[PDB]
Amino acid sequence: NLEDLKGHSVREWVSMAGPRLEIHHRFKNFLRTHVDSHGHNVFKERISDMCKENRESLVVNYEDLAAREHVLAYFLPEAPAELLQIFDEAALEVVLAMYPKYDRITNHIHVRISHLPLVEELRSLRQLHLNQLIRTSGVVTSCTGVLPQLSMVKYNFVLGPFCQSQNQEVKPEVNMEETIYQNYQRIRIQESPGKVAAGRLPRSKDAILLADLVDSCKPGDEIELTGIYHNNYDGSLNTANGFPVFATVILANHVAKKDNKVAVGELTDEDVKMITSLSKDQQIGEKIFASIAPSIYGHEDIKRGLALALFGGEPKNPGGKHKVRGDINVLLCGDPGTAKSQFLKYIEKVSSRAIFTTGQGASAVGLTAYVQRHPVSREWTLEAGALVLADRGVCLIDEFDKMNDQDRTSIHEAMEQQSISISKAGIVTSLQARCTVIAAANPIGGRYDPSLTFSENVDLTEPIISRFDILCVVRDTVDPVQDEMLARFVVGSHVRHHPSNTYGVEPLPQEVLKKYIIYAKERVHPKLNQMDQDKVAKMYSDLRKESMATGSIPITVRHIESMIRMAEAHARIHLRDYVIEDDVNMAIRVMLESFIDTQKFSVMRSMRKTFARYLS
Amino acid sequence: DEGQARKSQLQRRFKEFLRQYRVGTDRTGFTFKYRDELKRHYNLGEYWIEVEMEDLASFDEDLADYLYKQPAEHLQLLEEAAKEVADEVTRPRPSGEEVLQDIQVMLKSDASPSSIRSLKSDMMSHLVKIPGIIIAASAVRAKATRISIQCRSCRNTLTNIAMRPGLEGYALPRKCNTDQAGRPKCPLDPYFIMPDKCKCVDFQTLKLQELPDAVPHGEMPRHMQLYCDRYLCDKVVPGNRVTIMGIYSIKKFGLTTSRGRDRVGVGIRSSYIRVLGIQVDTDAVSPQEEEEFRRLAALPNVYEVISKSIAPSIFGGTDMKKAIACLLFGGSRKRLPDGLTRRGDINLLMLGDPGTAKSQLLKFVEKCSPIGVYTSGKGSSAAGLTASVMRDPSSRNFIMEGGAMVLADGGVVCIDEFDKMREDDRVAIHEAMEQQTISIAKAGITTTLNSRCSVLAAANSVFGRWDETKGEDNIDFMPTILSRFDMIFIVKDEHNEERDVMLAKHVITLHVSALTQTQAVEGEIDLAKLKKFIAYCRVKCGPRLSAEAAEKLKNRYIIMRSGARQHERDSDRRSSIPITVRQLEAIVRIAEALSKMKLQPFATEADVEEALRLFQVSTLDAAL
Amino acid sequence: WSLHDSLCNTSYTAARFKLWSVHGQKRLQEFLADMGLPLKQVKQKFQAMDISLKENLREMIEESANKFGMKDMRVQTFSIHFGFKHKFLASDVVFATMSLMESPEKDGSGTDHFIQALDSLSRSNLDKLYHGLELAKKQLRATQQTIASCLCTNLVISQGPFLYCSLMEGTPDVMLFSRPASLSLLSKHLLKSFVCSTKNRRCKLLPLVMAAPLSMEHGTVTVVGIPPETDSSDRKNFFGRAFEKAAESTSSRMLHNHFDLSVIELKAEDRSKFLDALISLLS
DNA sequence: AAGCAGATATCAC
DNA sequence: GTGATATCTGCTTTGGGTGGGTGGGTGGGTTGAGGCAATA
Numbered sequence A: 001n002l003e004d005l006k007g008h009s010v011r012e013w014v015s016m017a018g019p020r021l022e023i024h025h026r027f028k029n030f031l032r033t034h035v036d037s038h039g040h041n042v043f044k045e046r047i048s049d050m051c052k053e054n055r056e057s058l059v060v061n062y063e064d065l066a067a068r069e070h071v072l073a074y075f076l077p078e079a080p081a082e083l084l085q086i087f088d089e090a091a092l093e094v095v096l097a098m099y100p101k102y103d104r105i106t107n108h109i110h111v112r113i114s115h116l117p118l119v120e121e122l123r124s125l126r127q128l129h130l131n132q133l134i135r136t137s138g139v140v141t142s143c144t145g146v147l148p149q150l151s152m153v154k155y156n157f158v159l160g161p162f163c164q165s166q167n168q169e170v171k172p173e174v175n176m177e178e179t180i181y182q183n184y185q186r187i188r189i190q191e192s193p194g195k196v197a198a199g200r201l202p203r204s205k206d207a208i209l210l211a212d213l214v215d216s217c218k219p220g221d222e223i224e225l226t227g228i229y230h231n232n233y234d235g236s237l238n239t240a241n242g243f244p245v246f247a248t249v250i251l252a253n254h255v256a257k258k259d260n261k262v263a264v265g266e267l268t269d270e271d272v273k274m275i276t277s278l279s280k281d282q283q284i285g286e287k288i289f290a291s292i293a294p295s296i297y298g299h300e301d302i303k304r305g306l307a308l309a310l311f312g313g314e315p316k317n318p319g320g321k322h323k324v325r326g327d328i329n330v331l332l333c334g335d336p337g338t339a340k341s342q343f344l345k346y347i348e349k350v351s352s353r354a355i356f357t358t359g360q361g362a363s364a365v366g367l368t369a370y371v372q373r374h375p376v377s378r379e380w381t382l383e384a385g386a387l388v389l390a391d392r393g394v395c396l397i398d399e400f401d402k403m404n405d406q407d408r409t410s411i412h413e414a415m416e417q418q419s420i421s422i423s424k425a426g427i428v429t430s431l432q433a434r435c436t437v438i439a440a441a442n443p444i445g446g447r448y449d450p451s452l453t454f455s456e457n458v459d460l461t462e463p464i465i466s467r468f469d470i471l472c473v474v475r476d477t478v479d480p481v482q483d484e485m486l487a488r489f490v491v492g493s494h495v496r497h498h499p500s501n502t503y504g505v506e507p508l509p510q511e512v513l514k515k516y517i518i519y520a521k522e523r524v525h526p527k528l529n530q531m532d533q534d535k536v537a538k539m540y541s542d543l544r545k546e547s548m549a550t551g552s553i554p555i556t557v558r559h560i561e562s563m564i565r566m567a568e569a570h571a572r573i574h575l576r577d578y579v580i581e582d583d584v585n586m587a588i589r590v591m592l593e594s595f596i597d598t599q600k601f602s603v604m605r606s607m608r609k610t611f612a613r614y615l616s
Numbered sequence B: 001d002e003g004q005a006r007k008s009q010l011q012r013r014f015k016e017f018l019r020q021y022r023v024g025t026d027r028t029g030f031t032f033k034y035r036d037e038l039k040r041h042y043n044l045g046e047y048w049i050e051v052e053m054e055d056l057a058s059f060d061e062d063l064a065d066y067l068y069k070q071p072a073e074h075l076q077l078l079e080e081a082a083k084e085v086a087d088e089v090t091r092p093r094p095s096g097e098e099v100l101q102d103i104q105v106m107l108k109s110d111a112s113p114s115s116i117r118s119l120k121s122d123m124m125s126h127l128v129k130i131p132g133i134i135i136a137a138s139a140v141r142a143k144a145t146r147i148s149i150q151c152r153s154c155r156n157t158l159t160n161i162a163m164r165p166g167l168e169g170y171a172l173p174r175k176c177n178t179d180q181a182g183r184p185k186c187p188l189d190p191y192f193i194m195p196d197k198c199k200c201v202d203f204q205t206l207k208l209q210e211l212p213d214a215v216p217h218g219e220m221p222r223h224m225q226l227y228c229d230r231y232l233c234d235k236v237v238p239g240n241r242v243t244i245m246g247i248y249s250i251k252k253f254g255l256t257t258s259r260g261r262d263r264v265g266v267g268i269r270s271s272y273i274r275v276l277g278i279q280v281d282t283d284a285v286s287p288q289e290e291e292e293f294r295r296l297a298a299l300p301n302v303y304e305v306i307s308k309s310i311a312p313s314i315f316g317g318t319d320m321k322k323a324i325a326c327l328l329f330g331g332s333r334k335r336l337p338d339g340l341t342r343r344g345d346i347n348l349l350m351l352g353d354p355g356t357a358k359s360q361l362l363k364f365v366e367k368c369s370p371i372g373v374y375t376s377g378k379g380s381s382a383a384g385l386t387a388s389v390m391r392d393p394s395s396r397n398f399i400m401e402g403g404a405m406v407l408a409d410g411g412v413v414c415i416d417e418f419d420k421m422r423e424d425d426r427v428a429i430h431e432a433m434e435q436q437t438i439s440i441a442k443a444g445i446t447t448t449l450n451s452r453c454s455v456l457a458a459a460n461s462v463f464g465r466w467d468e469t470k471g472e473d474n475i476d477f478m479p480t481i482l483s484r485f486d487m488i489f490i491v492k493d494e495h496n497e498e499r500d501v502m503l504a505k506h507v508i509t510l511h512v513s514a515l516t517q518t519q520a521v522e523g524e525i526d527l528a529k530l531k532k533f534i535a536y537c538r539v540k541c542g543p544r545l546s547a548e549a550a551e552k553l554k555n556r557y558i559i560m561r562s563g564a565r566q567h568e569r570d571s572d573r574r575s576s577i578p579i580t581v582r583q584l585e586a587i588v589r590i591a592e593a594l595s596k597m598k599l600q601p602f603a604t605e606a607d608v609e610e611a612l613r614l615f616q617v618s619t620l621d622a623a624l
Numbered sequence C: 001w002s003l004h005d006s007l008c009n010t011s012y013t014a015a016r017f018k019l020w021s022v023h024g025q026k027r028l029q030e031f032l033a034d035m036g037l038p039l040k041q042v043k044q045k046f047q048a049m050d051i052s053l054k055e056n057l058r059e060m061i062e063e064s065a066n067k068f069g070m071k072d073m074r075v076q077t078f079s080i081h082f083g084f085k086h087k088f089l090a091s092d093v094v095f096a097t098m099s100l101m102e103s104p105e106k107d108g109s110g111t112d113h114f115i116q117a118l119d120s121l122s123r124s125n126l127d128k129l130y131h132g133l134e135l136a137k138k139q140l141r142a143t144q145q146t147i148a149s150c151l152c153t154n155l156v157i158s159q160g161p162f163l164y165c166s167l168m169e170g171t172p173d174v175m176l177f178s179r180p181a182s183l184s185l186l187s188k189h190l191l192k193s194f195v196c197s198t199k200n201r202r203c204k205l206l207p208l209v210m211a212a213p214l215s216m217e218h219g220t221v222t223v224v225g226i227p228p229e230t231d232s233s234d235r236k237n238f239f240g241r242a243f244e245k246a247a248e249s250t251s252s253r254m255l256h257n258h259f260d261l262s263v264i265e266l267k268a269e270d271r272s273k274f275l276d277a278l279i280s281l282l283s
Numbered sequence D: 001a002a003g004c005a006g007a008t009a010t011c012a013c
Numbered sequence E: 001g002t003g004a005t006a007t008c009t010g011c012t013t014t015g016g017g018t019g020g021g022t023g024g025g026t027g028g029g030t031t032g033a034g035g036c037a038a039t040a
C-alpha cells in the first residue's frame, strides 16, 4: 500500500523506485480518466487548449486531485519537489500521447496546483512550514526583468553537463553555446494595505518565478501565490543578527490574481455555450441593464449608461495617422444620498481592473504618473499612476467636484488622447492610458436646482464636461408613491441580506455577467459598416442649434464620436460583429435623453417636442 | 584537424557565395552584386558590406541555417571569406595600400521582426531581429581586437593574441614560458599588456526600448542593452526607431568571484544583443528621391498640395494647416558679421474652444516632422523642458541631461495643454524660444546648449470657451511670451447649420472608412514622403527676401503698427497681443518658408503677400 | 506569404474552416496543432521559416487536411525556376497578372492597367510581377473581409429559384469590386463559402445572382450570375439568355458590354422590376 | 604587502 | 613506519568607479538640485 510508510519520511518514501512508479501511474490515470459533474473529460479539453496556444503549463485543481487521488493529495504538501517532478514526467507522457509532434514545441510540461486549502498570511509563516507547499497572498512591490539563469552547464575539451540548484554555485569557463538556460524572475510580495493594522509596518517575502511562470504578475498587483517555502544559509544575515539565522524564499509554483477575476482563456466550452445562448435572448439588453447594482431601486438611465461604459466602444485608427478612442466616460451628478457612491463601488467590484479614488485623496501625479527619487542608483525614475495602472480598465473618481483644480486638470490628456506625457528630470516620454473614467460629483450648494441648467449647477467648465460621453443627472424628488416604493425596496434589501441568510426581467447572476463581459470585450469587435448618415448629421445640427440657444451644455464633434461608441457598445452587448440600425437608434436615444435632462424645468417640455421624432 | 577541415570547407562555401552570386536575367543582364559592392566599398575606403540572408539562402540554404543557429563562428568564417574576396577584386593595389584591411559583414533580412518580450532563454546564442526605439547612447570607446603581452621579469613577449568579439574579456597566462634553469623563477601573473602593440576598434553601448504599441496594458516599457562596433558605431541617436539584427548573448566577465561576489540569486547572468545590422525606420538621399523632390518643388500648386497633405483626416482648418506647413519648413537662420544671430524657426500658438482638433493637429506634426517631440504642459517642469542637473551613479559627479527642447533641437516641440503649465515653468522657455540656447549655471557647471527648435503650442481660453463679452480677459498669457509667437490663432467653434452637416458626414465616413484597405489620394503626399521632402528642403535651401519684396513688407509693417496703436488708444486698454519688431521678422520667416517649399533662392512679392495674409488671419485678427 | 496568412486568405481552407466565424479560428488552431507546426513559425514568412519544417510539408498538410475533412488539398500544377532566387508556381503568376489588370489604383486607366499586366509576363519586367504579387495579397484580404461581411449579416437571401446578394455603397471595400471581373470572382468565392457554411439543404443547390454599384452618376448597377457550386459541376451558365429574356419582357434598360453574356449593366431603378421577371422566368 | 587556506615534505619516536 | 609540524605556494585583498547599474542599498560612500505632499 502506498499510504503505509515503513519507517521513512514522505520524502524518503517517494524517493524510492516502487512508490515512485506507483505515483506516476496513479497520476497518469487521474489525468486520463477524471471527469466533472456532467461527465466531460476535463484534462482532454485542458490539454487541447494548452497545445492549441503552444503553452507549457497544465493547471491542476487541488480539490479534484484530493477527491480522486487522496494519497497523492496528502503527499503533495509534504514532499512538493519530488511529487511535482513526477507529475511533470507523467504530464509530458500524456501530452505526447495526445499530440505526438508536440515535442518540437517543448520538452517539459509544468504541473501547477491551484486552490490549495492551506492558506497562510505572510505574517504567520513559521519554521514548521519549511519545505512545504504553502499558499499565501499579497501585493507585488518589486519585480526584476526576466533574466537568464544557468540550468544545464557546460565548461571549457568541453566538460560534461552539470545541473544548477537555487542555493549554491556549481563546482566543475562556461560555454555559452552548449549551455542551457531558464527564465528567472524575483518578485517581492508585501502585506496588502487593507490587511495590515493601522500604523504598523508591513511584512514582506521574496519569491522566485521560473520558466513560463515569469511575467505572471506586475508591481501593484493583488496576487495569490502557491509555492515551496525554502531556506538557505546566508553569511551576511548571520553577521547582521549575531545568530545563525537562515534566509527564506518562496519557490513559486502557481500565481493567480484571485480577487474574483476570470480570464478569457479560462472560459470553458460550456461557458461559451451559455453566453451565446444568453445572447440569443430577445431581452438580453434589458437583462444586462437590470444586472447593474441590483440592490439599488431604479435609476434606469444610470444603469444603462454604466452598462454601456462597461462594455465599451471600438478604438479606430483609419490609416495609422488618426487615433480615435473607444472608451466611454461617465459623469454622475445629483442630490446627496442617491447611491452615486454605491454605483461606483459596484463598478469597482464587478470590473476586472478597477481603481477607486476620492476627491482630495487623489493628486495630479498620483493619478497619471510620478517621478521617484533614489539615494543610490539612477537618481530619477518614472512610475505609473492610477490612470496608467488602470490601462484597459476603469478609474472611478468619487467627490469629483471636491478635487483641487490643479489635480482635476491632470486627466485631460488621458481622457481624450489616452496617454500621459511626462517631461521631467531628464525623462521625456509618453505612457499608454486607455481607461474608462467614471466620476461622481455633487452640485453647487449640495442640491440640484431644477430652475437652472446643468452648466449653472456645477463648477466644471466646458473642456472637462465635453470629455464625458454620458452625463447623468440624479434628482431626489418627493413623491409619496415613489417614496413608498423606495422604502419597501430598501427594507426588503435589508431583510434579504441579513447575514443569517423595474425592467420586469430577471437579472443575470453576477458570476454569469462577469463571464459575459469578458467574452464580449475580448472575442467581439463590432464593425461599423453602414449608417444613416443623413439622419445622424441632421440630428447633430439640431443639437448644436439648441445648445447654443439655451447654453445648457456645450456640444462639440466629440458628441458625434460618442454616439458611434455607444452604438458599438450596444452591439457588443448583443455579441454582434456588425453594428446595425437598432444600435444606432439606441445610441441616439441615450444621447438625446441626456441632453434634455440638462435643460431648465420650463424648457424641458419644448425640448422633448423638438426631438420627438428621434425619441419615438 | 577534422574541425579545421570543417571550418575550411565552410569558409570555402562562403567565399564561393561571395564570388558567384548574381542578380538579373538573361533578357536584361547580370550583375555580380556582392563582389562588385565589396570592390567599390574597398576602393572608397569603407571596409564593410551588407549581405542579405535571403540571397545566402538562395545560394546555399544550409549556410543560412547555420548562420541563423550558430551566428558567431559562421559570421567569423564569412568575414574571413569577405577579406579573401576583397583581396582578389582589388589585388594589384596602389602604393600606401599594400596592407589588406579587415571587412565587417553586416546582416539584413526580410523576415518579420520579433519583440523584446518574446526574447526567451531558448533563443540564447541565436540570431534575432528586434524592433525598438533608441533611448540612450554611450560615448565611443576603444575595444581591443588583438593584444601583445610581455613578462615583467624576462621581457618574454607573446604577440598577436586574438580577442573575442562583444562584451567578453581575456584571461592572461598564469605562468611564463621562460626556461626554469639559471634565472630566479618568474612571479605569478607575470604578463602585462603592451599599450602600443594593441589594435583597437570603436565600440558603443545603446539602450533599446520596446515599441509603444507593443507594451502590455498597465506595464512600464522594457529595454535591452545593445553592443555596437566598427561601422555600426555612432549610426543611431536617441529617438531613432530601428530594427536590429543581432546575437542574443551573455556578458562573460572574469570567472573569479572578485570582491566576494554576493548576488541576490545564484547562477544568474547579464544578457545583451551583439548588433550585426541596423535599419532605421521612417516612423542620405538616393538620386531617384532627389529627382522626385525636385519635381514636387516645381509643381505650380505645390503650396496647395502640401497644405492638403497636413492632417488630411481633420475636416477644415485650411488657414491653420497652411501655417503649420510653413512652421514645418521654417525660415532661414542667419548670423550677422558682428556675431549676433537671427532665428529662422517659426512658433505657432492655437488658442481656442474645446473639441476643435487642436490636439489631433499636434499629434500629426509629431509624426510628420523629421525631428518631433510631443509633451504636455501639465506634465512638464522647467528642468524637464530645457535641461537638468543630476548626479551620475558611476562617477559620483554632477552631469547634465537634456530636456524636451534639447531632444527636439533641429525640429519641432509640440506643447499641448500650454495653459495648464505653471508660470515658473513657462518662464523657463523664454531664452530657448528666441536666442535658441539654454544657459546653465548650477552645481559647478557653466555651459550653453543648443535648442534650435520650433514651438507648436495649444491651449484653451480662460473661461473654457471664448466669450466675446469678456474681451481681453479671455487671454491670460503675459506679453513677453505672446510676442515670441510668430502666429497666434484664436479658434472659435462657430455653429452653422451648413458646416455642421458637412462635418458630421465627414466624421462618420472617416469612422466607416477605418475598415477600408488603405488607398492613395491623387492630390496629396503620403506622410513618409512628405517627411523626407521636408528634411531635404531644410538642408538644401536657405532663401532671402528680394529687394522688391522688402519694400512691400516695410510699408505694410508701418501701417500695421499705426493701426495697432490707434486701436489701443480708442479702447483705452493696452491689447493682449503685441505687434513688435519680432512680428516683422516673423513675416520674413514665413515668406522664406514659402520660398523654401519651391526650392527658390529668393522670396518674391507673392511670397510676402501670402505671408501677410496668414499674419492677418492669425495675429491681427486676435489683436483686433 | 506566411503559411498562416495563406491559410486565412485561401477561399478553400477559409470556407471549410468558417474563419469568418468565432469557432473557425479555434478550428484553425486545432489544425495547426495537429500539424505540429509552432505558431511563431507558421506566422513567419515562408522563406524565413526554418527549413526542417519544409522537408515534408506537403505530405503532412495533406494528411492533416484529410483528418479535417478536406480531401482536395493537393493539385497538379507547374512551377518555373530561374536564377538563384526566382521560383514561381503557375497560380501565383495568374493571381499577380489578374491583380495588375484589375488594380483599383485609378491614377492609371484600364488600357494602362492592361499594359502593365502584359509587361509583367516578360522576364525583363520582373519588378512588375512582384508588385502584382503584393497587390494580389491586398485583393485576397479584401475578398475575405467582404465575404465575412456578407455572410455574418445574412445578405445572401434565397428567392425561389436563385440566391440574391447585393452590395451597398456603405460597404468599405465596394470600390475594389465595381469592375465586372473582380465582381465575378468575388461572387464565385462567396458562393463557395456560403455553400460550405449554410444549413438549409435547398440553398446549397441554387445558383447566385450578385449586384454591385457601378456608377453613382447614372445610377447603374453591375449584375452577375453564376451557376450552382458542386464538386462535379459542368461549369455551364444559363444566366445570359435568362437576363436578356427578363429585360425584354419587362422593358428594362440593360447593356451587354462584357464578352461574357452573364455580366450586365442595369439601371438601378429598374433593378427591382427586373428581378421579379427573372424569378418568374426561372421558377 | 600581509595573512589565511591548502598542499606537502620532514623530523621524531 | 605514522603523527605531528614545519616549510612552501596560490589566493585575494583595497573599497571604486574600465566591475555593473540586467546585483542590491537591511552590505557601505555631503552637496546640490529636483520632484512630492503638506504647507502657508
Ligand SMILES: Nc1ncnc2c1ncn2[C@@H]1O[C@H](COP(=O)(O)OP(=O)(O)OP(=O)(O)O)[C@@H](O)[C@H]1O
Pocket (backbone or CB within 6 Å): A324, A416, A417, A463, A557, A558, A561, B313, B314, B315, B316, B352, B353, B354, B355, B356, B357, B358, B359, B360, B361, B459, B460, B503, B507
Ligand atoms: N474638424 C474636425 N474634423 C475631424 N475630426 C474632428 C474635428 N474636430 C474635432 N474632431 C475630432 O473630435 C475629437 C476632438 O478632440 P481633440 O482632443 O482633438 O480636441 P481639442 O480641440 O484639442 O480639445 P481640448 O481643447 O478640449 O483639448 C477628436 O476625436 C478629433 O479627431
Ligand SMILES: Nc1ncnc2c1ncn2[C@@H]1O[C@H](COP(=O)(O)OP(=O)(O)O)[C@@H](O)[C@H]1O
Pocket (backbone or CB within 6 Å): A295, A296, A297, A298, A335, A336, A337, A338, A339, A340, A341, A342, A343, A486, A490
Ligand atoms: N435608490 C436607492 N436604492 C437603494 N438604496 C439607496 C438608494 N439611494 C440611496 N440608497 C442608500 O443610501 C446610502 C447612502 O448613499 P450614498 O452612496 O452616500 O449616495 P451619495 O454618495 O450619492 O450620497 C447607501 O448606503 C445606499 O445603499
Ligand SMILES: [K+]
Pocket (backbone or CB within 6 Å): none
Ligand atoms: K555600489
Ligand SMILES: [K+]
Pocket (backbone or CB within 6 Å): none
Ligand atoms: K559593490
Ligand SMILES: [Mg+2]
Pocket (backbone or CB within 6 Å): A340, A341, A398
Ligand atoms: Mg457619495
Ligand SMILES: [Mg+2]
Pocket (backbone or CB within 6 Å): B358, B359, B360, B416
Ligand atoms: Mg486637446
Ligand SMILES: [Zn+2]
Pocket (backbone or CB within 6 Å): B151, B153, B154, B155, B156, B176, B177, B178, B186, B190
Ligand atoms: Zn618569464
